[PDB]
Design a binder for this molecule. Structure first.
Ligand SMILES: Cc1cccc(Cl)c1NC(=O)c1cnc(Nc2cccc(C(=O)NC3CC(C)(C)N(O)C(C)(C)C3)c2)s1
Length: 266
C-alpha cells in the first residue's frame, strides 16, 4: 500500500468521516487522476483505525478489472485518508434506480458478468466478502461494475444467518440476490417483508420471483445460487462461464422466464 503525501491530494467536492471526489498527483508529478477520498475524523477509536486501514490493506492485495483500484493511503498525517479510483456513476443499486428500464438485457447481463468475475477473483484469493449486495458495487462512466466496499439478513445465505458459516458458497447466495437486484433495476429484495418474514419464507423454500423481462437462463442461474444445500450451489467459476456463454450466444437470452402476473387487469 502506497503512502501518499498530502501535497498530492486535493478535495474538490463532498460525495457522502466523509467521502470526497478529488484529484491525485501521481508518477512523480507527471500524471493527475480523479479519485475518491474517504476520511477518518479525529477522535476515531483503535477499532475504527483497525477497520479503516484494514479495508485499505485488503483492497491493496487485489488487482482485477472488477475490483476497485486502491491508489494509496494517508496514514502518517491526519485526518487519515483512503484514496481509490473515482467511479463516476456511484453505487450500483442507486444507479439502476435512477436508470429504471433504460438498459438492455445484454447490458444488465454484462454488469453481472463483471461482478461475478470480481467475486471469482476474491474467492480464489481466499477472501469471503460476507456483505455482497449491489450497494457495495460501484459503477464507472463506461458501465463497468466493480466490487468496492470491503469493510443484512436478506442478502445472506441460510447457513451464514444461523451458524455464522460464511464461505464463498454463502457469497454465491448473495450474488444470486445481486442478480435479482440488477435485473429489477434495484428493487428491494423481498419487498416489504421484515427480516423475520424473509427467514420464514426462505426456510419454507420460497424464493424471489422472476424479474420482468428476465432471460429464463438468468433466472435459472439465480435460483441455483439459492440452493438450500451450499454444496449444490454453483461456484463463481461456473457463474462466470455460464454468463460468458450466454453473452456469446445472445439469442439464448431471448427465451424469457414467465413474469408472474401479481395483479389482475382485464
Ligand atoms: C469504495 C471505497 C472504499 C474505501 C475508500 C474509498 Cl475512497 C472508496 N471509494 C469510494 O467510496 C468511491 C469511489 N467512487 C465513488 N463514486 C461515487 C459515489 C457516490 C456517488 C457518486 C456520484 O457521482 N453519483 C451520481 C449521482 C447523480 C448525480 C444523482 N447522478 O445521476 C449520477 C451521475 C448517475 C450518479 C459517485 S465512491
Amino acid at each position: 500500500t502506497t503512502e501518499i503525501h498530502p501535497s498530492c491530494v486535493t478535495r474538490q467536492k463532498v460525495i457522502g468521516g466523509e467521502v470526497y471526489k478529488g484529484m491525485l498527483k501521481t508518477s512523480s508529478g507527471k500524471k493527475e487522476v480523479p479519485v475518491a477520498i474517504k476520511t477518518l475524523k479525529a477522535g476515531y477509536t483503535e477499532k475504527q483505525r483497525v477497520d479503516f486501514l484494514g479495508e485499505a490493506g485488503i483492497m491493496g492485495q487485489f488487482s482485477h478489472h472488477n475490483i476497485i483500484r486502491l491508489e494509496g493511503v494517508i496514514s502518517k498525517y491526519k485526518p487519515m485518508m483512503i484514496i481509490t479510483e473515482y467511479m463516476e456513476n456511484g453505487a450500483l443499486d442507486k444507479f439502476l434506480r435512477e436508470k429504471d428500464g433504460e438498459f438492455s438485457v445484454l447490458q444488465l447481463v454484462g454488469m453481472l458478468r463483471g461482478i461475478a468475475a470480481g467475486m471469482k477473483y476474491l474467492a480464489n484469493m481466499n477472501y469471503v466478502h460476507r456483505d455482497l449486495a449491489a450497494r457495495n458495487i460501484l459503477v464507472n462512466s463506461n458501465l463497468v461494475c466493480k466490487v468496492s466496499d470491503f469493510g443484512p439478513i436478506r442478502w445472506t445465505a441460510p447457513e451464514a444467518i444461523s451458524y455464522r458459516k460464511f464461505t464463498s458458497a454463502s457469497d454465491v447466495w448473495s450474488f444470486g440476490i445481486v442478480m435479482w437486484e440488477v435485473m429489477t433495476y434495484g428493487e428491494r429484495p423481498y419487498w416489504e417483508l421484515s427480516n423475520h418474514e424473509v427467514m420464514k419464507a426462505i426456510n419454507d423454500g420460497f424464493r424471489l420471483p422472476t424479474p420482468m423481462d428476465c432471460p429464463s437462463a438468468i433466472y435459472q442461474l439465480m435460483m441455483q445460487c439459492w440452493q438450500q444445500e451450499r454444496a449444490r450451489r454453483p461456484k463463481f467459476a461456473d457463474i462466470v462461464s455460464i454468463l460468458d456463454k450466454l453473452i456469446r450466444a445472445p439469442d439464448s437470452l431471448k427465451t424469457l422466464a414467465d413474469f408472474d402476473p401479481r395483479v389482475s387487469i382485464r
